């Protein structure tokens, strides 16, 4: 069961990198 709660975090982490990358792109477009 525990192996399921760790796939959530992994999607959440990979989505966070997409989040941060998008911000860096936006911010480079201002920079």
């Amino acid at each position: 069961t525990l192996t399921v709660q760790a796939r959530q975090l992994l999607s959440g982490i990979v989505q966070q990198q997409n989040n941060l990358l998008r911000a860096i792109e936006a911010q480079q477009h201002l920079l």
Binding site: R7, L10, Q17, L21, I24
Partner: peptide, 29 residues
Amino acid sequence: YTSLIHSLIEESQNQQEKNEQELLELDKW
């Protein structure tokens, strides 16, 4: 530094798409 940033952003975009595949590949289990 801007050419470098452009290159790093494109590498990131490519790495992001890969990771999402590799997670989608772990989703097909």
